[PDB]
Amino acid sequence: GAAQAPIVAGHPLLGSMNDLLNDPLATYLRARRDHGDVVRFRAGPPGLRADIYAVFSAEGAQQVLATESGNFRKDNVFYGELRDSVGNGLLTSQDATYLRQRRLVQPLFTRRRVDGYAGQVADEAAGLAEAWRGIPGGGVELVGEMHRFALRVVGRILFGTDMETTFEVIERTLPLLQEYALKRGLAPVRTPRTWPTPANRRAARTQAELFALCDGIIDSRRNSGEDLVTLLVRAGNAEDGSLDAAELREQVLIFLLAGHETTATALAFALHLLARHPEQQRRVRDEADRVLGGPGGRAPTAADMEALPYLTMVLKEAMRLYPSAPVIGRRAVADAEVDGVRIPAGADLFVSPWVTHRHPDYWPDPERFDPERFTPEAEAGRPRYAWFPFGGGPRACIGQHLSMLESVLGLAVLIREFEFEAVGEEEVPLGAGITLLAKGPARCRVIPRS
Ligand code: HEM
Numbered sequence: 001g002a003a004q005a006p007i008v009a010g011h012p013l014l015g016s017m018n019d020l021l022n023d024p025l026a027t028y029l030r031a032r033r034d035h036g037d038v039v040r041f042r043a044g045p046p047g048l049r050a051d052i053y054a055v056f057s058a059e060g061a062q063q064v065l066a067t068e069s070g071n072f073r074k075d076n077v078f079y080g081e082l083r084d085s086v087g088n089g090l091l092t093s094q095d096a097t098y099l100r101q102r103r104l105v106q107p108l109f110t111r112r113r114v115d116g117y118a119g120q121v122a123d124e125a126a127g128l129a130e131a132w133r134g135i136p137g138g139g140v141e142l143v144g145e146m147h148r149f150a151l152r153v154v155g156r157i158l159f160g161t162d163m164e165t166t167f168e169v170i171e172r173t174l175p176l177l178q179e180y181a182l183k184r185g186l187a188p189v190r191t192p193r194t195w196p197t198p199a200n201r202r203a204a205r206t207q208a209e210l211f212a213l214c215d216g217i218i219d220s221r222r223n224s225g226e227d228l229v230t231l232l233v234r235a236g237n238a239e240d241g242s243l244d245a246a247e248l249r250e251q252v253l254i255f256l257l258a259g260h261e262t263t264a265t266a267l268a269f270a271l272h273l274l275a276r277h278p279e280q281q282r283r284v285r286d287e288a289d290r291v292l293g294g295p296g297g298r299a300p301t302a303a304d305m306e307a308l309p310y311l312t313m314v315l316k317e318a319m320r321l322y323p324s325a326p327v328i329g330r331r332a333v334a335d336a337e338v339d340g341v342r343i344p345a346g347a348d349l350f351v352s353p354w355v356t357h358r359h360p361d362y363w364p365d366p367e368r369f370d371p372e373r374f375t376p377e378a379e380a381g382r383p384r385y386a387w388f389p390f391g392g393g394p395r396a397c398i399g400q401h402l403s404m405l406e407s408v409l410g411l412a413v414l415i416r417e418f419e420f421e422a423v424g425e426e427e428v429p430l431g432a433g434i435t436l437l438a439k440g441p442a443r444c445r446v447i448p449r450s
Contacts (some may be wrong), residue, residue: 002335002342005053015042021290024432025326029356030264032056039343048188053332053349054105058362058385060338061351064330065385066393072330074395075444076348078185079329084193085181085207087250090398091258104243108228109398114405115302116224120156121406122299124149125413132418132446141208142268142275142442150264151256158255159217160227166213173210174256178254182433214249228255255399261435262324263403270318270411272428272442273369275420280371284311288416293450297416300409311317311415315407319389321369326354326432328391354432362386373404393427419447 008031010016019027020041031039039059040352043049055064064072074094083092090101107113128149132140151171156164180203184190193200221230234252236242243251274281292305294297327350336343343349358366362382363373372378379387390397397403424443431437 001340002337003340005051005341005343006035007042007051008035008039010042011044014044018046019100025354025430028054028056028327030402031357032355032359036063036339036341038339038343039058040233043188050346050348051348053343054355055338055343055349055351056355056359057339058356058359058383058388061385061388062383062392063336063338063355064349064351065328065391065395068336069393069395071333071336072349074329074335075331076185076329077190078182081181081185082178085177085184085203086253086257087246089250089254091254099249100240101247103237103240105232105398108231108235108400111401113231114402117157117402118302118405118409119299121153121409122125122301122310122413124156125155125410126299127152129417130359131206132414133448135446137449139443139445142444143264143428143438146264146268147261150267150406151260152258153410154259154263157402158252166217169209169213170256172204173213174253174260176206177210177433178257180206187380210253211249214252215245218245218248218252241393257434258397259399259403263406265322265324265436265438266315266319266403266407267410268438268442269322269428270315270407271414271420271444272422272426273318273321274314274415274420275444276426280314280369281420282417284411284415285419287311288412292412292416295417300412302405302409304412305405305408308412309409311408312404313374315404315411316374316387317369317371318386320357320363321367322436323353323357323389324333324429324435325389325391326436327352351388353387354436356386356388359386417449419449421445421447 008016008019008027010019016027027041031054033039037055037060039050039054039056041054042051050421065135074092080094088097090098090105093101128145148171151167155167155170159166180199191197191200193203217229218233221227221233229248229252232243232248274284287308287310289295289297291304292300300308329350330349332343332345332347332349357363360366363386385392390400390403421444422442423445425440427440428442429439431439
């Protein structure tokens with residue numbers, strides 16, 4: 001006896017089109033508050049787009065992402081636009097194509113291989129510290145600062161040293177190809193990319209430049225402290241052979257796309273919360289000072305992650321309030337039942353870390369910043385999928401441990417060398433694209449500790 005999904009209140013004629021455009025994050029929370037855990041969003045005018053379903057329960061998220069993963073596919077139009085824009089890499093691939101890619105890439109994402117990149121993160125963070133030590137204003141805009149820093153960390157991990165050259169090209173090329181794909185995947189009309197419109201021409205020129213850069217970097221590595229491009233080029237097994245040149249580029253691009261804004265968002269918001277919460281900052285500082293030796297102390301290592309649990313708890317709470325992926329899209333193959341509600345075959349649907357992380361059934365006083373929610377005991381008192389920023393199940397984030405290594409060890413250096421104080425508006429307005437979008441500045445004063 002499957003129930004029908006309630007339609008989220010919206011415009012009499014346009015449905016949720018205006019609400020999802022103006023304030024999608026507030027629309028998602030209202031949908032749960034007024035209509036429940038399985039809802040349907042209507043578009044207008046009638047006949048433009050099929051109803052998009054939404055699952056906000058932890059148990060429904062476990063079903064969509066893990067228990068019944070086979071019924072929920074990456075067949076949404078957005079995924080097709082990303083594949084056309086950056087190639088059919090590990091994030092967008094499905095079936096046999098994905099299985100061969102997973103067989104060849106998983107070896108590069110082992111805890112030991114990832115832990116080997118700890119010194120690169122520590123060096124990049126010490127570099128940011130020296131630059132911040134010479135800021136005459138003593139102030140930073142964290143969204144902008146962490147956007148640069150995160151690309152530098154993932155790019156050092158990918159391409160090694162002296163790649164500020166490649167950084168500036170990627171910095172200006174990749175975001176445009178992502179916007180092109182996001183805007184087309186969410187659009188109600190799609191003129192072919194071959195069509196010679198000014199926008200489609202600009203995107204193909206952007207693609208050419210980035211593709212050629214990637215191919216040159218990859219071809220230089222065709223000729224341990226090895227970079228990830230070197231290990232992707234040397235990936236091979238008996239059944240799958242090795243990755244081709246197009247396959248190599250698709251993975252480099254997907255790693256850059258999946259690790260640049262995601263880690264930036266987490267770093268900026270963790271630092272912003274610590275800037276607005278002095279007691280929690282003092283706790284992270286006393287922990288950093290005890291493990292690394294204080295201002296002017298030693299570089300953090302991968303093993304220091306076990307000795308930095310409050311910082312880990314601050315990060316998880318930042319990713320609860322500010323999930324870098326606020327929604328995860330899927331498409332139903334066959335009729336399904338989630339929380340007693342029917343999700344039809346062919347239906348585009350989405351789980352939302354943004355809503356489930358603020359759900360009153362799992363989160364007391366959900367908008368309060370409290371790292372103590374992530375003690376092992378508190379985690380046991382709540383369902384597993386109440387917190388899922390890296391997703392879950394077979395398609396969970398492969399760089400989850402890398403992101404935590406870069407965040408914990410990164411923030412450890414910055415808190416060991418600087419005190420943070422929020423300046424100006426502390427409420428950063430938020431939107432949603434591929435990732436959580438900052439629609440406001442996160443200003444902060446950096447005070448050198450030595
Ligand atoms: C070092 C940084 C990162 C890298 C290189 C990276 C890479 C990737 C890759 C390759 C995938 C596809 C995994 C697969 O299908 O087998 C993925 C999935 C995912 N990543 Fe990450 N990631 C990083 C950081 C983050 C962070 C900080 C978040 C925080 C929100 C995040 C959230 C996700 C989510 C939700 C998925 C699942 C998407 C889905 O199921 O459709 N990633 N990541």
